[PDB]
């Protein structure tokens, strides 16, 4: 039994490039009692990997989740053909004792892709759900500003906000994403790379300002949005992707006088905070919503484990519409 594994040859400087990654073919030992052999089906690439990769030693395996099928088993709880969520990192084949695996929701129908397990009915969906509903605390009738709005998390934020009856202003990096999100029904969508003035565009989009800011981007973009938050506005600090691949020091922070005078609340969160019943309910709500068409899905699928680095790099550079998935 062989595996293929993507390792970090060299720490990234700026954006990664191909020579930073190295693929190793490796032999797995046999199963011991109570272990299984997992075959990757779908693997995710995610922005957090750009940051978490800084903690690895050169030669280490890249971290990440996958949908896997059990192909050999000495574990009764896990027969062959069982589909699991697993986090062995970027590897085609792996050995588990079963304690680290997660079976899908029972009510998971065969009419949606298994890979939504890594997207809208998964971690990025949960991030959206908790960031917007608990961190921003959206009630109904609010104007929500969301950036990276065609991406895995932000696309879900916007749709959840719409179904709760909020006005949504979304920023994206391409005209293709603009048109996709308008078709979806977001109230205002613009391309932040081409508008003449971000400030003016944000003002035209919502003259009265913003109640909530679901921030995926940080940096200068956020400095500008902060200038148009309403008094007591709430910012969920979900991510800061404009800084993850940045070469120099960080950009200037936000103008303190504005943050103080507008009495802003800003809270960062990590999705893994919500566990047990709270998490299970969230997942069932997301699946429900997808089954009802209240949340549409789109995926950006890259074919072949050997292109996993390219899939990661393109997502960080904005290639993707919807969740970036690698099909094994
Ligand atoms: N628990 C947490 O707190 C948590 C969990 C998951 C994800 N996140 C964060 O959520 C954000 C979105 O994650 P995702 O998984 O849904 O990925 P994503 O939105 O599917 O993909 C990343 C998107 O980021 C945008 N982007 C990249 N560089 C940018 C820049 N300099 N300025 C503006 N936009 C830029 C690009 O879209 P554009 O074409 O629109 O530029 C790119 O498509 C990231 O900040 C991620 O770290 C946080
Ligand atoms: O805090 C996290 C983080 C926390 C837990 C994670 O879990 C990944 C492993 N996985 C979790 C559950 C299943 C088994 C393994 C991932 C990122 C994030 C960051 C961080 C900061 C400092 C650091 O040294 C490392 C990472 S950056 C980041 C961006 C995100 O979009 C999400 C989380 C994060
Ligand atoms: O990486 C983390 C993690 C990071 C920091 C944590 O605590 C930060 C400070 N810690 C607090 C207690 C005292 C020591 C320092 C806990 C988990 C993972 C999780 C986490 C859980 C809750 C939360 O709010 C944020 C993240 S869940 C998880 C699963 C993994 O396989 C690996 C990492 C993780
Ligand atoms: Cl897992």
Give domain limits for the chain: 1-119+298-328, 120-297
Q: Is residue 152 a known part of a binding site? A: yes
Distance CA 53, CA 32 (A): 31
- The response to whether residue 272 sits with its C-beta less than 6 Å from ligand 3 reads yes
Alpha-helical segments (H) within the chain:
48-52, 123-130, 152-163, 175-184, 198-205, 219-226, 241-244, 256-261, 276-291, 308-316
User: What is the residue with the minimal CA distance to atom 28 of ligand 2?
Assistant: 48
Q: Which two tokens stand for residue 19?
A: 């020579």
Query: How far from chain centre, in Å, is Cα 252?
Result: 26
For 101, 162, 272, the CA distances from 157, given in Å and listed in that order, are 27, 9, 17
**Topology alike, domains 1-119+298-328 and 120-297:** no
Technique used to solve these coordinates:
X-ray
Ligand 2 centroid, distance to 262 Cα (angstroms): 31
The reported resolution of this PDB entry, expressed in Å, is 2.2
Closest listed ligand to the CA of 66 = 4
Residues in the chain: 328
Q: Is residue 26 a known part of a binding site? A: no
1-119+298-328: CATH topology: Quinone Oxidoreductase; Chain A, domain 1 (3.90.180)
Distance CA 147, CA 207 (A): 18
Distance CA 180, CA 212 (A): 22
Distance CA 144, CA 225 (A): 11
User: What is the residue with the minimal CA distance to atom 46 of ligand 1?
Assistant: 239
User: What is the residue with the minimal CA distance to atom 11 of ligand 2?
Assistant: 272
Superfamily, domain 120-297: NAD(P)-binding Rossmann-like Domain (3.40.50.720)
Per DSSP, 133 falls in state I
Helices and strands (H and E) in the chain: how many: 10, 15
For 141, 193, 250, 289, the CA distances from 256, given in Å and listed in that order, are 28, 26, 16, 40
Tell me if 51 sits within 8 A of 23, measured CB to CB. no
Q: Which residues lie below 8 Å from residue 135, measured CB to CB, with a gap of 6+?
A: 234, 236, 238, 267, 269
């Amino acid at each position: 039994s062989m595996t293929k594994t993507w390792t970090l040859k060299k720490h990234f400087v700026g954006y990664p490039t191909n020579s930073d990654f190295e693929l190793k073919t490796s032999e797995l030992p046999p199963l011991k009692n109570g272990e299984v052999l997992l075959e990757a089906l779908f693997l995710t690439v995610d922005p957090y990997m750009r940051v978490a990769a800084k903690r690895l030693k050169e030669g280490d395996t890249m971290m990440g989740q996958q949908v896997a099928k059990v192909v050999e088993s000495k574990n009764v709880a896990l027969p062959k053909g069982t589909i699991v969520l697993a986090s062995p990192g970027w590897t085609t084949h792996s050995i588990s004792d079963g304690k680290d695996l997660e079976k899908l929701l029972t009510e998971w129908p065969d009419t949606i892709p298994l890979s939504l397990a890594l997207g809208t009915v998964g971690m990025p969906g949960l991030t959206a759900y908790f960031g917007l509903l608990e961190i921003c605390g959206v009630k109904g009738g609010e104007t929500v500003m969301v950036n990276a709005a065609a991406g895995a998390v932000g696309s879900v934020v916007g749709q959840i906000a719409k179904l709760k009856g909020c006005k949504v202003v979304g920023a994206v990096g391409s005209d293709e994403k603009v048109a996709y999100l308008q078709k979806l029904g977001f109230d205002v969508v613009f391309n932040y790379k081409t508008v003449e003035s971000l400030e003016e565009t944000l003002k035209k989009a919502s003259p009265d300002g913003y109640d909530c800011y679901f921030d995926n981007v940080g940096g200068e973009f956020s400095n500008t949005v902060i200038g148009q938050m309403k008094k007591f506005g709430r910012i969920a600090i979900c991510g800061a992707i404009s800084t993850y691949n940045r070469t120099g020091p960080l950009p200037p922070g936000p103008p303190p006088e504005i943050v103080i005078y507008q009495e802003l609340r800003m809270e960062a969160f990590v999705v893994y905070r919500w566990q047990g019943d709270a998490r299970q309910k969230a997942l069932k709500d997301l699946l429900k919503w997808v089954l009802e068409g209240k949340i549409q899905y789109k995926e950006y699928i890259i074919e072949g484990f050997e292109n996993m680095p390219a899939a990661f790099m393109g997502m960080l550079k904005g290639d993707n519409l919807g969740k970036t998935i690698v099909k094994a």
